[PDB]
């Protein structure tokens, strides 16, 4: 439901991070969140990443905010991972299932590293600092990508489902 926080004028923001959040948000906003926790966790993440684009520079009084942001992002990643596994378990399709399983392996690595990088960046709030930022932005972009890809493999996995199953993500478009 919620909207993407447009970048206000005279706002210091990591544009690479904001753009990638914007696109992850765009992909997810195509689906109603009703009956689909992956789509809801995706929207949540896009928004947290938008906030993090405002935190990398941030400056005074933003360390906790940054470490907390990374924390909530990781929590959302965990939920997306967990739901993708369950979707995969019931996928009949060999290829779709393989792809799905691939990301449920990648996402945890990325989210663990985002937490490490967020923290090492918080201790710096210079070349070294600037590198801490670039490492974080690179990682965050990998996260936005994996999640976008997860949204799509899981939507394709809802086309060909198992008959003996107890699980269902609802995939209904949102029309403007």
């Amino acid at each position: 439901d919620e909207e993407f926080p447009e970048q206000k004028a005279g706002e210091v923001i990591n544009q690479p991070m904001m753009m990638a959040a914007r696109q992850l948000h765009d992909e997810a906003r195509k689906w109603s969140s009703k009956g689909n926790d992956i789509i809801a966790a995706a929207k949540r993440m896009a928004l947290l990443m938008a906030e993090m684009s405002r935190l990398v520079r941030g400056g005074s009084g933003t360390k906790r905010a940054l470490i907390q942001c990374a924390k909530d992002i990781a929590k959302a990643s965990d939920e997306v991972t967990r739901l993708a596994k369950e979707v995969a378990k019931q996928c009949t399709d060999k290829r779709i299932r393989t792809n799905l399983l691939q990301v449920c392996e990648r996402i945890p690595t990325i989210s663990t590293q985002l937490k490490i990088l967020s923290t090492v960046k918080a201790t710096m709030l210079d070349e070294e600092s600037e590198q801490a930022t670039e490492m974080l932005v690179h990682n965050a972009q990998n996260l936005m990508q994996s999640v976008k890809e997860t949204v799509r493999e899981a939507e394709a996995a809802s086309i060909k489902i198992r008959t003996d199953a107890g699980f269902t993500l609802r995939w209904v478009r949102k029309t403007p």
Binding site: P16, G61, K63, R64, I67, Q102, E105, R106, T109, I110, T112, Q113, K115, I116, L117, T119, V120, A122, T123, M124, E128, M135, H138, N139, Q141, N142, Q145
Partner: protein, 262 residues
């Protein structure tokens, strides 16, 4: 549309830093609650002891490497790294001690965040310094194989062939074992796949190479038998193997997120 590698490229780098950062994160939060909110920072003796515990092993186990390795770049750059870590711990300790007297001490808050930054920076240096040496160890071994494959064309007798085989066999077992352990460490799935497929290809060309060489010696020793193709056949195998080893060497060098940038 393509997967960029993670910032931390081995499971070891990631697993050792993760808990150090987890512990550091709490210290950072309290540090900001003191500064920003102005709360008395509580006794950090224990959290700082845990932080130390997390790295004293790494410093320890890494000091048992400047006494177990031959790499001169390592012996050179390892020490500057312990000292960075060790000094950051010392700072962390002073902050705890200092804040244990004055929960509002500011020179201690500078020590708290500075030691915190130092610990993560120093541990990262240590780990990357071990890894760079690990990659030098491996590449030097693949390179040794490339060199020997280069000698194959000199084997003209069964006696030499029998000698060649005796040396090539092991060097291939070592490289195979190293590449296997290495691939089990990479965090980037795609590099692991490339490593595994190249090693597989290299393992299967081995017997064909030796056989192409057997046939060469046999044919060369026959009377009025052509050896032009027996020759090409051997050279062709040596070149496919070399290309695979070079591909392994190339991937092994993909250890910088920097170079696979967005």
């Amino acid at each position: 549309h393509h997967h960029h590698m993670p910032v931390f490229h081995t499971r070891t780098i990631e697993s050792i830093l993760e808990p150090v950062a987890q512990q550091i994160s709490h210290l950072v939060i309290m540090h900001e609650e003191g500064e920003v909110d102005g709360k008395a920072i509580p006794d950090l003796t224990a959290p700082v002891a845990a932080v130390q515990a997390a790295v004293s092993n790494l410093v320890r186990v890494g000091k048992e490497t400047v006494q177990t390795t031959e790499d001169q770049i390592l012996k050179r750059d390892m020490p500057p790294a312990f000292i960075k870590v060790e000094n950051a711990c010392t700072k962390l300790v002073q902050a705890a001690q200092m804040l244990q007297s004055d929960p509002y001490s500011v020179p201690a808050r500078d020590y708290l965040i500075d030691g915190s930054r130092g610990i993560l920076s120093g541990t990262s240096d240590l780990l990357l310094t071990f890894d760079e040496a690990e990659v030098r160890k491996i590449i030097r071994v693949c390179k040794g194989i490339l060199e020997y494959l280069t000698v194959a064309e000199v084997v003209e007798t069964m006696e030499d062939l029998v000698t060649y085989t005796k040396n090539l066999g092991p060097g291939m077992t070592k490289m195979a074992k190293m590449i296997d352990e290495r691939q089990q460490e990479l965090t980037h799935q795609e590099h692991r796949v490339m490593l595994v497929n190249s090693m597989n290809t290299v393992k299967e060309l081995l017997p064909v190479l030796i056989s192409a060489m057997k046939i060469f010696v046999t044919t060369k020793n026959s009377k009025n038998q052509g050896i032009e193709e027996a020759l090409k056949n051997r050279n062709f195998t040596v070149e496919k193997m070399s290309a695979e080893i070079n591909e392994i060497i190339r991937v092994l060098q993909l250890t910088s997120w920097d170079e696979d940038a967005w």
